[PDB]
PDB file of all heavy atoms in Angstrom:
ATOM      1  N   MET A  54       6.910  -1.085   4.606  1.00 34.67           N
ATOM      2  CA  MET A  54       5.598  -0.781   3.943  1.00 34.67           C
ATOM      3  C   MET A  54       5.301   0.588   3.616  1.00 34.67           C
ATOM      4  O   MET A  54       4.836   0.887   2.500  1.00 34.67           O
ATOM      5  CB  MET A  54       4.406  -1.457   4.674  1.00 34.67           C
ATOM      6  CG  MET A  54       4.319  -2.851   4.636  1.00 34.67           C
ATOM      7  SD  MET A  54       2.926  -3.534   5.575  1.00 34.67           S
ATOM      8  CE  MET A  54       3.465  -2.996   7.169  1.00 34.67           C
ATOM      9  N   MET A  55       5.736   1.489   4.483  1.00 35.03           N
ATOM     10  CA  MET A  55       5.385   2.926   4.427  1.00 35.03           C
ATOM     11  C   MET A  55       3.944   2.974   4.279  1.00 35.03           C
ATOM     12  O   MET A  55       3.149   2.204   4.756  1.00 35.03           O
ATOM     13  CB  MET A  55       6.141   3.598   3.196  1.00 35.03           C
ATOM     14  CG  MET A  55       7.752   3.268   3.268  1.00 35.03           C
ATOM     15  SD  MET A  55       8.412   3.401   1.483  1.00 35.03           S
ATOM     16  CE  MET A  55       7.638   1.922   0.841  1.00 35.03           C
ATOM     17  N   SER A  56       3.399   3.982   3.469  1.00 35.73           N
ATOM     18  CA  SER A  56       2.072   4.335   3.293  1.00 35.73           C
ATOM     19  C   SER A  56       1.214   3.181   2.748  1.00 35.73           C
ATOM     20  O   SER A  56       0.078   3.264   2.753  1.00 35.73           O
ATOM     21  CB  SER A  56       1.725   5.487   2.456  1.00 35.73           C
ATOM     22  OG  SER A  56       2.195   6.690   3.182  1.00 35.73           O
ATOM     23  N   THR A  57       1.904   2.070   2.073  1.00 33.69           N
ATOM     24  CA  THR A  57       1.322   0.922   1.470  1.00 33.69           C
ATOM     25  C   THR A  57       0.466   0.266   2.486  1.00 33.69           C
ATOM     26  O   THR A  57      -0.430  -0.455   2.144  1.00 33.69           O
ATOM     27  CB  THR A  57       2.153   0.032   0.602  1.00 33.69           C
ATOM     28  OG1 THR A  57       3.130  -0.547   1.594  1.00 33.69           O
ATOM     29  CG2 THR A  57       3.002   0.819  -0.382  1.00 33.69           C
ATOM     30  N   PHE A  58       0.788   0.324   3.759  1.00 36.93           N
ATOM     31  CA  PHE A  58       0.121  -0.410   4.852  1.00 36.93           C
ATOM     32  C   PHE A  58      -1.369   0.138   5.084  1.00 36.93           C
ATOM     33  O   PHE A  58      -2.092  -0.654   5.567  1.00 36.93           O
ATOM     34  CB  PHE A  58       0.918  -0.138   6.234  1.00 36.93           C
ATOM     35  CG  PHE A  58       0.411   0.875   7.155  1.00 36.93           C
ATOM     36  CD1 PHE A  58      -0.708   0.690   8.033  1.00 36.93           C
ATOM     37  CD2 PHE A  58       0.781   2.232   7.011  1.00 36.93           C
ATOM     38  CE1 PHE A  58      -1.119   1.734   8.964  1.00 36.93           C
ATOM     39  CE2 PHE A  58       0.287   3.210   7.818  1.00 36.93           C
ATOM     40  CZ  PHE A  58      -0.663   2.938   8.731  1.00 36.93           C
ATOM     41  N   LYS A  59      -1.696   1.330   4.589  1.00 37.85           N
ATOM     42  CA  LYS A  59      -3.008   1.874   4.724  1.00 37.85           C
ATOM     43  C   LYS A  59      -4.034   1.136   3.977  1.00 37.85           C
ATOM     44  O   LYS A  59      -5.282   1.015   4.482  1.00 37.85           O
ATOM     45  CB  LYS A  59      -2.970   3.337   4.369  1.00 37.85           C
ATOM     46  CG  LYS A  59      -2.106   4.292   5.158  1.00 37.85           C
ATOM     47  CD  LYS A  59      -1.567   5.567   4.566  1.00 37.85           C
ATOM     48  CE  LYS A  59      -0.823   6.286   5.587  1.00 37.85           C
ATOM     49  NZ  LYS A  59      -0.249   7.432   5.081  1.00 37.85           N
ATOM     50  N   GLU A  90       2.342  15.016  10.729  1.00 43.10           N
ATOM     51  CA  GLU A  90       2.821  15.585   9.483  1.00 43.10           C
ATOM     52  C   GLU A  90       2.096  14.955   8.305  1.00 43.10           C
ATOM     53  O   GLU A  90       1.729  13.569   8.469  1.00 43.10           O
ATOM     54  CB  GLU A  90       4.261  15.266   9.217  1.00 43.10           C
ATOM     55  CG  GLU A  90       5.223  15.836  10.313  1.00 43.10           C
ATOM     56  CD  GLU A  90       6.524  14.984  10.572  1.00 43.10           C
ATOM     57  OE1 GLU A  90       7.274  14.812   9.501  1.00 43.10           O
ATOM     58  OE2 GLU A  90       6.683  14.395  11.581  1.00 43.10           O
ATOM     59  N   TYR A  91       1.716  15.561   7.334  1.00 41.68           N
ATOM     60  CA  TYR A  91       0.942  15.191   6.006  1.00 41.68           C
ATOM     61  C   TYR A  91      -0.450  14.719   6.378  1.00 41.68           C
ATOM     62  O   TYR A  91      -0.711  13.576   6.449  1.00 41.68           O
ATOM     63  CB  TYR A  91       1.861  14.082   5.299  1.00 41.68           C
ATOM     64  CG  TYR A  91       1.090  13.936   3.879  1.00 41.68           C
ATOM     65  CD1 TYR A  91       1.357  14.902   2.909  1.00 41.68           C
ATOM     66  CD2 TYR A  91       0.254  12.942   3.641  1.00 41.68           C
ATOM     67  CE1 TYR A  91       0.796  14.748   1.756  1.00 41.68           C
ATOM     68  CE2 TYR A  91      -0.433  12.909   2.384  1.00 41.68           C
ATOM     69  CZ  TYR A  91      -0.137  13.841   1.449  1.00 41.68           C
ATOM     70  OH  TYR A  91      -0.766  13.807   0.232  1.00 41.68           O
ATOM     71  N   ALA A 112      -6.926   8.131   3.818  1.00 38.51           N
ATOM     72  CA  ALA A 112      -5.768   7.261   4.082  1.00 38.51           C
ATOM     73  C   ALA A 112      -5.328   6.754   2.729  1.00 38.51           C
ATOM     74  O   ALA A 112      -4.029   6.826   2.513  1.00 38.51           O
ATOM     75  CB  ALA A 112      -6.138   6.122   5.007  1.00 38.51           C
ATOM     76  N   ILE A 113      -6.070   6.248   1.866  1.00 38.05           N
ATOM     77  CA  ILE A 113      -5.642   5.559   0.602  1.00 38.05           C
ATOM     78  C   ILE A 113      -5.461   6.530  -0.556  1.00 38.05           C
ATOM     79  O   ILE A 113      -4.426   6.520  -1.132  1.00 38.05           O
ATOM     80  CB  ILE A 113      -6.688   4.431   0.321  1.00 38.05           C
ATOM     81  CG1 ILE A 113      -6.567   3.253   1.328  1.00 38.05           C
ATOM     82  CG2 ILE A 113      -6.423   3.934  -1.160  1.00 38.05           C
ATOM     83  CD1 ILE A 113      -7.776   2.243   1.243  1.00 38.05           C
ATOM     84  N   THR A 114      -6.508   7.487  -0.741  1.00 36.47           N
ATOM     85  CA  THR A 114      -6.511   8.268  -1.998  1.00 36.47           C
ATOM     86  C   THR A 114      -5.465   9.394  -1.848  1.00 36.47           C
ATOM     87  O   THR A 114      -4.819   9.792  -2.815  1.00 36.47           O
ATOM     88  CB  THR A 114      -7.951   8.826  -2.247  1.00 36.47           C
ATOM     89  OG1 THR A 114      -8.284   9.755  -1.382  1.00 36.47           O
ATOM     90  CG2 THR A 114      -8.925   7.806  -2.420  1.00 36.47           C
ATOM     91  N   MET A 115      -5.339   9.947  -0.667  1.00 34.98           N
ATOM     92  CA  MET A 115      -4.456  11.050  -0.279  1.00 34.98           C
ATOM     93  C   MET A 115      -3.292  10.773   0.628  1.00 34.98           C
ATOM     94  O   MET A 115      -2.396  11.565   0.886  1.00 34.98           O
ATOM     95  CB  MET A 115      -5.268  12.229   0.301  1.00 34.98           C
ATOM     96  CG  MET A 115      -6.162  12.914  -0.672  1.00 34.98           C
ATOM     97  SD  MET A 115      -5.112  13.896  -1.779  1.00 34.98           S
ATOM     98  CE  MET A 115      -4.794  12.781  -3.105  1.00 34.98           C
ATOM     99  N   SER A 116      -3.272   9.388   1.037  1.00 32.83           N
ATOM    100  CA  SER A 116      -2.140   9.066   2.035  1.00 32.83           C
ATOM    101  C   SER A 116      -2.099   9.897   3.292  1.00 32.83           C
ATOM    102  O   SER A 116      -1.051  10.086   3.764  1.00 32.83           O
ATOM    103  CB  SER A 116      -0.840   9.011   1.264  1.00 32.83           C
ATOM    104  OG  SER A 116      -0.016   7.932   1.783  1.00 32.83           O
ATOM    105  N   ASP A 117      -3.363  10.351   3.690  1.00 33.06           N
ATOM    106  CA  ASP A 117      -3.420  11.269   4.935  1.00 33.06           C
ATOM    107  C   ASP A 117      -2.841  10.466   6.038  1.00 33.06           C
ATOM    108  O   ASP A 117      -3.262   9.203   6.421  1.00 33.06           O
ATOM    109  CB  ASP A 117      -4.858  11.642   5.242  1.00 33.06           C
ATOM    110  CG  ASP A 117      -4.984  12.720   6.201  1.00 33.06           C
ATOM    111  OD1 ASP A 117      -4.610  12.459   7.370  1.00 33.06           O
ATOM    112  OD2 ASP A 117      -5.511  13.738   5.864  1.00 33.06           O
ATOM    113  N   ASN A 118      -1.891  10.978   6.845  1.00 34.77           N
ATOM    114  CA  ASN A 118      -1.260  10.237   7.997  1.00 34.77           C
ATOM    115  C   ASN A 118      -2.047  10.398   9.187  1.00 34.77           C
ATOM    116  O   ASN A 118      -2.161   9.239   9.936  1.00 34.77           O
ATOM    117  CB  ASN A 118       0.196  10.823   8.269  1.00 34.77           C
ATOM    118  CG  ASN A 118       1.261  10.133   7.394  1.00 34.77           C
ATOM    119  OD1 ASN A 118       1.061   8.998   6.829  1.00 34.77           O
ATOM    120  ND2 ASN A 118       2.375  10.747   7.278  1.00 34.77           N
ATOM    121  N   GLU A 152       1.943   6.490  12.567  1.00 32.15           N
ATOM    122  CA  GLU A 152       2.445   7.560  11.637  1.00 32.15           C
ATOM    123  C   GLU A 152       2.969   8.607  12.561  1.00 32.15           C
ATOM    124  O   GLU A 152       2.383   9.014  13.578  1.00 32.15           O
ATOM    125  CB  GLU A 152       1.305   7.976  10.781  1.00 32.15           C
ATOM    126  CG  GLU A 152       1.010   7.019   9.682  1.00 32.15           C
ATOM    127  CD  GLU A 152       2.175   6.931   8.577  1.00 32.15           C
ATOM    128  OE1 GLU A 152       3.158   7.583   8.711  1.00 32.15           O
ATOM    129  OE2 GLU A 152       1.881   6.209   7.609  1.00 32.15           O
ATOM    130  N   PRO A 153       4.177   9.308  12.175  1.00 32.36           N
ATOM    131  CA  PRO A 153       5.100   8.923  11.111  1.00 32.36           C
ATOM    132  C   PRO A 153       6.249   7.904  11.331  1.00 32.36           C
ATOM    133  O   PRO A 153       7.028   7.734  10.431  1.00 32.36           O
ATOM    134  CB  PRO A 153       5.530  10.206  10.651  1.00 32.36           C
ATOM    135  CG  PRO A 153       5.842  10.861  11.921  1.00 32.36           C
ATOM    136  CD  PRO A 153       4.669  10.491  12.876  1.00 32.36           C
ATOM    137  N   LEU A 155       6.595   4.726  11.763  1.00 33.90           N
ATOM    138  CA  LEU A 155       6.689   3.382  11.068  1.00 33.90           C
ATOM    139  C   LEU A 155       7.452   3.541   9.698  1.00 33.90           C
ATOM    140  O   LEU A 155       7.769   2.510   9.104  1.00 33.90           O
ATOM    141  CB  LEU A 155       5.340   2.945  10.734  1.00 33.90           C
ATOM    142  CG  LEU A 155       4.344   3.607   9.850  1.00 33.90           C
ATOM    143  CD1 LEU A 155       4.612   3.201   8.416  1.00 33.90           C
ATOM    144  CD2 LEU A 155       2.867   3.500  10.309  1.00 33.90           C
ATOM    145  N   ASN A 156       7.800   4.907   9.328  1.00 33.40           N
ATOM    146  CA  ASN A 156       8.611   5.094   7.999  1.00 33.40           C
ATOM    147  C   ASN A 156      10.164   5.221   8.251  1.00 33.40           C
ATOM    148  O   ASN A 156      10.768   5.624   7.313  1.00 33.40           O
ATOM    149  CB  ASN A 156       8.032   6.379   7.406  1.00 33.40           C
ATOM    150  CG  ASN A 156       6.494   6.319   7.127  1.00 33.40           C
ATOM    151  OD1 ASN A 156       6.111   5.598   6.229  1.00 33.40           O
ATOM    152  ND2 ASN A 156       5.786   7.036   7.915  1.00 33.40           N
ATOM    153  N   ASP A 200      -6.876   6.785  -6.179  1.00 43.17           N
ATOM    154  CA  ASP A 200      -5.471   7.110  -5.714  1.00 43.17           C
ATOM    155  C   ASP A 200      -5.179   8.555  -6.482  1.00 43.17           C
ATOM    156  O   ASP A 200      -5.127   8.520  -7.605  1.00 43.17           O
ATOM    157  CB  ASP A 200      -4.569   6.121  -5.715  1.00 43.17           C
ATOM    158  CG  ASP A 200      -3.160   6.398  -5.213  1.00 43.17           C
ATOM    159  OD1 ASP A 200      -2.955   7.411  -4.490  1.00 43.17           O
ATOM    160  OD2 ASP A 200      -2.250   5.549  -5.526  1.00 43.17           O
ATOM    161  N   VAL A 202      -2.268  10.452  -5.498  1.00 41.57           N
ATOM    162  CA  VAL A 202      -0.792  10.698  -5.052  1.00 41.57           C
ATOM    163  C   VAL A 202       0.351   9.776  -5.677  1.00 41.57           C
ATOM    164  O   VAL A 202       1.460  10.048  -5.425  1.00 41.57           O
ATOM    165  CB  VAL A 202      -0.658  10.762  -3.526  1.00 41.57           C
ATOM    166  CG1 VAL A 202      -1.356  11.924  -2.901  1.00 41.57           C
ATOM    167  CG2 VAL A 202      -1.274   9.373  -2.902  1.00 41.57           C
ATOM    168  N   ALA A 203      -0.161   9.014  -6.596  1.00 40.51           N
ATOM    169  CA  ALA A 203       0.775   8.042  -7.311  1.00 40.51           C
ATOM    170  C   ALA A 203       0.920   8.250  -8.796  1.00 40.51           C
ATOM    171  O   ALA A 203       1.155   7.379  -9.576  1.00 40.51           O
ATOM    172  CB  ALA A 203       0.144   6.624  -7.036  1.00 40.51           C
ATOM    173  N   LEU A 206       4.141   7.212 -10.954  1.00 45.27           N
ATOM    174  CA  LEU A 206       4.593   5.826 -10.825  1.00 45.27           C
ATOM    175  C   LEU A 206       4.016   4.973 -11.926  1.00 45.27           C
ATOM    176  O   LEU A 206       4.152   5.262 -13.015  1.00 45.27           O
ATOM    177  CB  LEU A 206       4.354   5.326  -9.346  1.00 45.27           C
ATOM    178  CG  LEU A 206       4.995   6.138  -8.225  1.00 45.27           C
ATOM    179  CD1 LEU A 206       4.771   5.500  -6.862  1.00 45.27           C
ATOM    180  CD2 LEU A 206       6.288   6.339  -8.568  1.00 45.27           C
ATOM    181  N   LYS A 220      -1.714   1.887  -4.402  1.00 43.19           N
ATOM    182  CA  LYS A 220      -1.219   2.643  -3.146  1.00 43.19           C
ATOM    183  C   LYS A 220       0.194   2.757  -3.215  1.00 43.19           C
ATOM    184  O   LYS A 220       0.869   1.716  -3.182  1.00 43.19           O
ATOM    185  CB  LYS A 220      -1.886   2.017  -1.858  1.00 43.19           C
ATOM    186  CG  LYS A 220      -1.477   2.794  -0.536  1.00 43.19           C
ATOM    187  CD  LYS A 220      -2.394   4.024  -0.374  1.00 43.19           C
ATOM    188  CE  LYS A 220      -1.709   4.955   0.545  1.00 43.19           C
ATOM    189  NZ  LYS A 220      -0.626   5.755  -0.145  1.00 43.19           N
ATOM    190  N   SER A 221       0.747   4.094  -3.015  1.00 40.75           N
ATOM    191  CA  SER A 221       2.143   4.313  -2.991  1.00 40.75           C
ATOM    192  C   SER A 221       2.697   4.513  -1.596  1.00 40.75           C
ATOM    193  O   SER A 221       1.804   4.605  -0.623  1.00 40.75           O
ATOM    194  CB  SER A 221       2.456   5.460  -3.869  1.00 40.75           C
ATOM    195  OG  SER A 221       1.633   6.565  -3.498  1.00 40.75           O
ATOM    196  N   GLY A 222       3.998   4.640  -1.395  1.00 37.32           N
ATOM    197  CA  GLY A 222       4.688   4.867  -0.085  1.00 37.32           C
ATOM    198  C   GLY A 222       6.011   5.346  -0.345  1.00 37.32           C
ATOM    199  O   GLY A 222       6.637   5.036  -1.324  1.00 37.32           O
ATOM    200  N   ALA A 223       6.395   6.060   0.678  1.00 37.13           N
ATOM    201  CA  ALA A 223       7.793   6.740   0.769  1.00 37.13           C
ATOM    202  C   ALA A 223       8.144   6.753   2.194  1.00 37.13           C
ATOM    203  O   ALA A 223       7.313   6.884   2.970  1.00 37.13           O
ATOM    204  CB  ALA A 223       7.829   8.007   0.062  1.00 37.13           C
ATOM    205  N   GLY A 224       9.509   6.677   2.506  1.00 36.17           N
ATOM    206  CA  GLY A 224       9.909   6.652   3.853  1.00 36.17           C
ATOM    207  C   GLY A 224      11.345   7.192   3.872  1.00 36.17           C
ATOM    208  O   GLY A 224      11.930   7.638   2.814  1.00 36.17           O
ATOM    209  N   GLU A 225      12.036   7.022   4.986  1.00 39.65           N
ATOM    210  CA  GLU A 225      13.491   7.501   5.267  1.00 39.65           C
ATOM    211  C   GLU A 225      14.402   6.597   4.414  1.00 39.65           C
ATOM    212  O   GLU A 225      13.977   5.541   4.028  1.00 39.65           O
ATOM    213  CB  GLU A 225      13.823   7.491   6.682  1.00 39.65           C
ATOM    214  CG  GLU A 225      12.865   8.370   7.560  1.00 39.65           C
ATOM    215  CD  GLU A 225      12.627   9.784   7.097  1.00 39.65           C
ATOM    216  OE1 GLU A 225      13.514  10.403   6.477  1.00 39.65           O
ATOM    217  OE2 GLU A 225      11.617  10.392   7.409  1.00 39.65           O
ATOM    218  N   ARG A 229      10.788   3.617  -1.035  1.00 47.57           N
ATOM    219  CA  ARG A 229       9.743   3.970  -2.020  1.00 47.57           C
ATOM    220  C   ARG A 229       8.996   2.669  -2.427  1.00 47.57           C
ATOM    221  O   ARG A 229       9.797   1.663  -2.460  1.00 47.57           O
ATOM    222  CB  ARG A 229      10.244   4.704  -3.097  1.00 47.57           C
ATOM    223  CG  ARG A 229       9.300   5.431  -4.044  1.00 47.57           C
ATOM    224  CD  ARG A 229       8.882   6.692  -3.579  1.00 47.57           C
ATOM    225  NE  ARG A 229       8.127   7.529  -4.440  1.00 47.57           N
ATOM    226  CZ  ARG A 229       6.806   7.828  -4.192  1.00 47.57           C
ATOM    227  NH1 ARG A 229       6.158   7.260  -3.214  1.00 47.57           N
ATOM    228  NH2 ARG A 229       6.125   8.707  -4.939  1.00 47.57           N
ATOM    229  N   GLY A 230       7.714   2.688  -2.650  1.00 49.75           N
ATOM    230  CA  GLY A 230       7.094   1.460  -3.032  1.00 49.75           C
ATOM    231  C   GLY A 230       5.653   1.676  -3.668  1.00 49.75           C
ATOM    232  O   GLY A 230       5.147   2.794  -3.461  1.00 49.75           O
ATOM    233  N   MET A 256      13.652  11.567  -4.842  1.00 53.20           N
ATOM    234  CA  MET A 256      12.262  11.195  -5.052  1.00 53.20           C
ATOM    235  C   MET A 256      12.071  10.962  -6.577  1.00 53.20           C
ATOM    236  O   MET A 256      11.381   9.955  -6.950  1.00 53.20           O
ATOM    237  CB  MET A 256      11.353  12.152  -4.456  1.00 53.20           C
ATOM    238  CG  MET A 256       9.929  11.718  -4.429  1.00 53.20           C
ATOM    239  SD  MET A 256       9.807  10.077  -3.536  1.00 53.20           S
ATOM    240  CE  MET A 256      10.179  10.425  -1.929  1.00 53.20           C
TER     241      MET A 256
HETATM  242  C1  NXL B  23       3.371   7.266   2.874  1.00 43.47           C
HETATM  243  O1  NXL B  23       4.390   6.455   2.777  1.00 43.47           O
HETATM  244  N1  NXL B  23       3.682   8.533   3.388  1.00 43.47           N
HETATM  245  C2  NXL B  23       2.457   9.493   3.443  1.00 43.47           C
HETATM  246  C3  NXL B  23       2.693  10.719   2.522  1.00 43.47           C
HETATM  247  N2  NXL B  23       2.532  10.331   1.094  1.00 43.47           N
HETATM  248  O2  NXL B  23       3.669   9.772   0.503  1.00 43.47           O
HETATM  249  S1  NXL B  23       2.969   8.561  -0.550  1.00 43.47           S
HETATM  250  O3  NXL B  23       1.969   9.091  -1.415  1.00 43.47           O
HETATM  251  O4  NXL B  23       4.108   7.765  -1.168  1.00 43.47           O
HETATM  252  O5  NXL B  23       2.244   7.648   0.314  1.00 43.47           O
HETATM  253  C4  NXL B  23       4.041  11.307   2.665  1.00 43.47           C
HETATM  254  C5  NXL B  23       5.178  10.484   2.839  1.00 43.47           C
HETATM  255  C6  NXL B  23       5.035   9.057   3.533  1.00 43.47           C
HETATM  256  C7  NXL B  23       5.156   9.154   5.083  1.00 43.47           C
HETATM  257  N3  NXL B  23       6.551   9.448   5.525  1.00 43.47           N
HETATM  258  O6  NXL B  23       4.420   8.981   5.984  1.00 43.47           O
END
Side-chain angles (χ1 to χ4, degrees):
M54 281 178 297
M55 310 154 292
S56 289
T57 67
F58 99 91
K59 292 160 180 178
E90 302 152 64
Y91 194 74
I113 292 168
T114 71
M115 282 293 92
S116 210
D117 192 301
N118 274 343
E152 284 289 4
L155 66 85
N156 304 285
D200 181 17
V202 285
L206 297 189
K220 181 76 202 76
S221 50
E225 305 306 334
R229 193 84 173 107
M256 189 54 63

